[PDB]
Amino acid sequence: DFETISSETLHTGAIFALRRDQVRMPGGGIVTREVVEHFGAVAIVAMDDNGNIPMVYQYRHTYGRRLWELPAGLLDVAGEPPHLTAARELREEVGLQASTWQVLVDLDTAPGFSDESVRVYLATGLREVGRPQADMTMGWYPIAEAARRVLRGEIVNSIAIAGVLAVHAVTTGFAQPRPLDTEWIDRPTAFAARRAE
Amino acid sequence: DFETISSETLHTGAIFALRRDQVRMPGGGIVTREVVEHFGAVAIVAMDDNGNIPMVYQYRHTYGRRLWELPAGLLDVAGEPPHLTAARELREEVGLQASTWQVLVDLDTAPGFSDESVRVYLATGLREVGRPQADMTMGWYPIAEAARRVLRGEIVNSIAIAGVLAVHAVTTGFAQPRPLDTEWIDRPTAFAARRAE
Numbered sequence: 375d376f377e378t379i380s381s382e383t384l385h386t387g388a389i390f391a392l393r394r395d396q397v398r399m400p401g402g403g404i405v406t407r408e409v410v411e412h413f414g415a416v417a418i419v420a421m422d423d424n425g426n427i428p429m430v431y432q433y434r435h436t437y438g439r440r441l442w443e444l445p446a447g448l449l450d451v452a453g454e455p456p457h458l459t460a461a462r463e464l465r466e467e468v469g470l471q472a473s474t475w476q477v478l479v480d481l482d483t484a485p486g487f488s489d490e491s492v493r494v495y496l497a498t499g500l501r502e503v504g505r506p507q508a509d510m511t512m513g514w515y516p517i518a519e520a521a522r523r524v525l526r527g528e529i530v531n532s533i534a535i536a537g538v539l540a541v542h543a544v545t546t547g548f549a550q551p552r553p554l555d556t557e558w559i560d561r562p563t564a565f566a567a568r569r570a571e
Numbered sequence: 572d573f574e575t576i577s578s579e580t581l582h583t584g585a586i587f588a589l590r591r592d593q594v595r596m597p598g599g600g601i602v603t604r605e606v607v608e609h610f611g612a613v614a615i616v617a618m619d620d621n622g623n624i625p626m627v628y629q630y631r632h633t634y635g636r637r638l639w640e641l642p643a644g645l646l647d648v649a650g651e652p653p654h655l656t657a658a659r660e661l662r663e664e665v666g667l668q669a670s671t672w673q674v675l676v677d678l679d680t681a682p683g684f685s686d687e688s689v690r691v692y693l694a695t696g697l698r699e700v701g702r703p704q705a706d707m708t709m710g711w712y713p714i715a716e717a718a719r720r721v722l723r724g725e726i727v728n729s730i731a732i733a734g735v736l737a738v739h740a741v742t743t744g745f746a747q748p749r750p751l752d753t754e755w756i757d758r759p760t761a762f763a764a765r766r767a768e
Binding site: 376384385387388389390394395397399406407408409410412415433434435436437438441443479480481483485486487488489490491509521522527530531532533535536539540542543548549550552556559560 | 573581582584585586587589591592594596597603604605606607609612630631632633634635638640645676677678679680681682683684685686687688706718719721722724727728729730732733736737739740743745746747749753756757
């Protein structure tokens with residue numbers, strides 16, 4: 375198999391680090407692979423009694439504009455269980471508490487160059503508790519409308535794609551949400567390791 | 572609005588660069604935003620007469636394992652039109668030529684820290700022409716099976732999520748593929764600019 379031969383840190387920053395490995399390709403052979411180590415993140419599809427979900431309208435420095443995204447947050451508190459981060463983030467970002475939490479879909483955002491992976495939850499049985507901001511607008515969408523916004527390129531954040539389409543497959547009876555103990559295969563850990571310290 | 576106040580290059584490498592900007596938040600206020608500038612990429616959902624699509628099984632240094640992904644390739648040839656890169660990549664990677672090409676879905680893989688964006692095509696009217704490798708296995712899947720593999724976490728590459736779910740919405744009559752001239756809003760350009768030179 376593939377083996378990290380050597381490895382070096384090129385940069386460390388607020389939310390990720392940049393590492394450069396040399397990897398033994400099988401058999402014989404040597405590539406340079408750069409990995410942006412990231413904290414990992416969670417997001418929530420909060421589905422009300424009628425099939426509506428909340429979304430935020432978040433400025434992204436990288437595209438010079440705002441995207442429609444799901445509520446979400448970095449795994450930036452050491453050792454904190456992901457599901458508890460998600461509930462926390464739901465309350466901070468959109469002012470929602472939810473009774474029932476299930477795994478909806480996991481994704482590897484950029485396999486090409488980052489370890490970042492993202493667990494998206496389905497949260498149901500909802501209640502508003504306040505703090506719905508700074509520059510973030512939020513708004514709600516029936517799920518079917520959200521899915522057609524994906525298909526028209528009005529929602530392009532790829533965690534929102536995966537989340538909205540996945541819940542759409544649930545609401546149309548194609549698939550089932552899953553238990554909280556579903557293994558998150560690619561949960562990131564390298565950057566949390568490095569930060570501990 | 573938001574304005575880049577200053578900007579500096581921290582690293583330049585084979586397939587991306589790492590930049591650090593200072594951004595004026597409105598009104599008054601200053602954040603550091605790091606952007607990994609990337610080439611952009613395309614991928615293809617190649618759908619045969621019967622609803623089957625090809626997928627590759629590609630080792631990802633970043634997760635220490637292989638993922639099921641769609642055929643795909645970086646926009647790494649200067650000025651080459653994306654749709655022509657996609658046809659090229661389809662032939663190099665999976666040995667397919669396609670008659671008809673349409674836009675399926677675009678995504679922004681990691682808005683949090685990269686500009687990378689990805690145009691995924693629907694390619695139909697297919698013919699095998701050879702070169703189906705090195706370490707990449709490929710295999711075919713009915714679309715419905717592929718969509719249930721997403722929903723079970725057997726496919727987690729987020730371009731494969733977006734691509735397989737999007738085509739699933741087409742095959743089940745929920746949405747339509749779109750013309751090649753659909754604007755790709757977030758086509759990356761910063762790293763191609765920097766490389767020219």
